[PDB]
Amino acid sequence: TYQERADELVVKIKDMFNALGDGDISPSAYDTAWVARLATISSDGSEKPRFPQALNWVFNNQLQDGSWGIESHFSLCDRLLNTTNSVIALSVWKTGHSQVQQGAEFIAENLRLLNEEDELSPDFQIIFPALLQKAKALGINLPYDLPFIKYLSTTREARLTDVSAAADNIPANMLNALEGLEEVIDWNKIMRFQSKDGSFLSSPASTACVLMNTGDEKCFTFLNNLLDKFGGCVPCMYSIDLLERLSLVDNIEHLGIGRHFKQEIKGALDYVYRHWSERGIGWGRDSLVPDLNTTALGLRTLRMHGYNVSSDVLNNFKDENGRFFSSAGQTHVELRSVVNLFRASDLAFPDERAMDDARKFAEPYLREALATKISTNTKLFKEIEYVVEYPWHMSIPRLEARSYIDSYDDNYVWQRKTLYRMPSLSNSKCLELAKLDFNIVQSLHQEELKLLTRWWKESGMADINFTRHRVAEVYFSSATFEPEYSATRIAFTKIGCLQVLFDDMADIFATLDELKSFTEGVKRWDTSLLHEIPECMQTCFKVWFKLMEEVNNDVVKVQGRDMLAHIRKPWELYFNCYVQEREWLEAGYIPTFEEYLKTYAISVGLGPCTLQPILLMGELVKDDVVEKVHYPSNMFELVSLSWRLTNDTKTYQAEKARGQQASGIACYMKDNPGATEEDAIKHICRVVDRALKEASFEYFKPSNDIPMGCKSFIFNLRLCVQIFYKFNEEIKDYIRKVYIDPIQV
């Protein structure tokens, strides 16, 4: 059964968290072969392998086709690098004759397939011809003079002269390709690039090359310890203790299953936070040179989990021209790093210039990549498309999870100088659990919708012709999906349906007098004025009043005491704003921007759909805390502001055509003669953008008295308006994906 399989996967993933160390990463043939080339001198003066275990690994790990590499993941550049270095290692030590022969055959066959249109792997044009030069000196028979191969050698020779002609020798941005630049390196000057663990850019191949030329003891210790840890081989990079923790957390949260791992996540993030630095971070705690990907992932993930981190860490990766780079130790810019840069920018607080710069660079870069470089029919296209089309402030949690389940690749191989696996980060258990859990939670939502449809009938809403499908749309907008908040979602959906009903009532039907009558009835919180309004409005009031009774009875159970006095206020405020709107409309009055917002930021309706539902979540809301989490707290007011203004930009045109003059647009223009509608819309969008960032700041802001679950419900109500009233797919598609179609498991 689903629940049983999910339960054991949760146990298995928790074990993974508990077992986190320096990182789970595959052996690297290219790196292990470089380590295998290293010599030591015996007592008698003869040369022998310094690391015989590494040589033996090479000896024993040739693939069936004669190459070395990752068997199920063939890539031409990877296989050529792995195989050529492996044949070099065996040849140097006069061993593995048969493997050398078959290796040379593979290389010769595949050099004939390397062409000018093949996408070459990072620094391949430097590190590969360096291997060919060595192979040729060892007398290995390969077609070195094929046109494109000669071209690679010539390009490398130009790079060599650039370094030798450089006053300061090898520049930082060539560090990634150190071992391909051996014959021109200044071995004294290069040592300034060494990490505290003795490695060079965490790369065992590069570290072996430095060791070969210098004898440096710290290089030896890094390699010796790494071989011991891996049982006689090495990976392409180590350690990866920061990247692995951050990405495991990020992936789990993104997949929609983070609620199962709260304690494990806190543990992983506490570890990373200890190693967090104003200069950014690299894959591992000992990196001298940090990288954009790990730093951006760090900024986003730590911030998302309430840690205090500064966006200024991003300035470490920005050049004079406002462009970002992945690492000072390389020349190529990695697409994944730019994706994570954009995702980190989603969590900007107000006036964080580094986030502004990050997004201004990353967004065009990603859109350019989607339009020019990425194949439409891939998980990567879908993933990045979602990143830019549904960014954080318009990302509904279940939609985000559902999309990522389809774009998460659980059989992925990473590319740096060569290919490698990180089994914690491309993980079939994580994906399987995400699918099972989504289905289980979905069944819960389906039952909630079943109860809501039953209520739709029994309450009388069906009788008064409330649209059945509107129920599901309000329900979807609740956003806070976790199983423990069923009662809150159900109450929110009932109240939202009445608010939809009320708004239509106030427009299409009610006169001002009838509106005032209805409102006085709300203020009295009784049925004493039902007689003053039309039968249809009476029915509306009665459905609402009955709901209030049922909901308030439930609030007494959860909160431990009567909270009617609190609960009455938002309903009074809401209806009073309705009368104010109508008074202005009949008087043809256009308020100032400030005066407009004072009324319309309330009338948009965040008050009623939040107070009663957040009181059913479970957290204690003390009398003095109501105003700190609900109206008029800053976060609440900011969400309200985003609601009203975003709605205005989307709908003010249609409203004007119906005789409604007051809007954010019209009122700003009245305050500001000379400002066009376009100017007002631009200003309003800036106000909304800032309000969303400010709400984010307020949300993550630590407090000793404000309940975070309640804050989360209010904060995540910002999403529905951003997604529906944004200045492709529609609501029916969202509901299908989230509530109707299960995921094939």
Ligand SMILES: C=C1CC[C@H]2C(C)(C)CCC[C@]2(C)[C@H]1CCN(C)CCOP(=O)(O)OP(=O)(O)O
């Ligand atoms: C795209 C939408 C889904 C989510 C929904 C809520 C957020 C649940 C509140 C009602 C409006 C809406 C925004 C909704 C807009 C629907 N849009 C066609 C609204 C266009 O005008 P309308 O006369 O209101 O259409 P009707 O509502 O179907 O009669």
Ligand SMILES: C=C1CC[C@H]2C(C)(C)CCC[C@]2(C)[C@H]1CCN(C)CCOP(=O)(O)OP(=O)(O)O
């Ligand atoms: C802004 C809203 C999003 C969230 C939504 C739920 C909470 C999901 C259900 C109740 C209605 C509403 C509050 C909803 C109200 C939107 N509106 C119908 C009400 C207010 O907007 P309006 O300018 O007076 O009319 P509109 O332009 O045609 O919409």
Ligand SMILES: [Mg+2]
């Ligand atoms: Mg074999």
Ligand SMILES: [Mg+2]
């Ligand atoms: Mg209206």
Ligand SMILES: [Mg+2]
């Ligand atoms: Mg509107």
